[PDB]
Amino acid sequence: HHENLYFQGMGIRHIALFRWNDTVTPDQVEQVITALSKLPAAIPELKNYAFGADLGLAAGNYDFAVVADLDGEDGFRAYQDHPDHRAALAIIAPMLADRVAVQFAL
Amino acid sequence: HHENLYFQGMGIRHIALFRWNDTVTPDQVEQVITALSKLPAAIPELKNYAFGADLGLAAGNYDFAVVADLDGEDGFRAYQDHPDHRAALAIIAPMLADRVAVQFAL
Ligand SMILES: O=[N+]([O-])c1ccccc1
């Protein structure tokens, strides 16, 4: 919920889409929401993020999206390596049937 | 490249990630960029969009992302039905090895 961004170098939009496995319960999705909200890896290079559960509007969709806007490849690497981020990946990993990602220049 | 948004109802972030088939050439990706830029289905409910090719930063990523922020399910449906949108889907469809999508509440 922000609010104009300013990148010093190349702005990178990271996206990951998740498809849950059979293991996953609504409370676990709530856990993922809590984790993404409190472990955001909010380094200065992370300018904006958004995430949420699929709204059920299209047959065949995946279940969940996370988007993170990062200032530069150095920003992106620092984000990947940040402890918050490794803790969040850890929470999600056992829940995944699939994950597809792209990073593009914003 | 905008710039604070205002939704009258529920803001919906649509995301689609594409994985090209063997058919696809760099010039065709350029065609997709041109199409998404000139056929955006820019109804009043479409508040913001972004799209681009994957930057090659992570082994196993998909090839291309499009993101569209829509005001309400009525916005989302009007967008799906807009001629620009049907023309863009038409261009992309033959190029796809896979497509994964989510819509979430922004
Ligand atoms: O890319 N990811 O899979 C991801 C990104 C941010 C937080 C947790 C997971």
Ligand SMILES: O=[N+]([O-])c1ccccc1
């Ligand atoms: O969701 N999509 O596949 C899509 C969205 C917008 C423009 C073209 C294709």
Ligand SMILES: [Cl-]
């Ligand atoms: Cl943080």
Ligand SMILES: [Cl-]
């Ligand atoms: Cl338009």
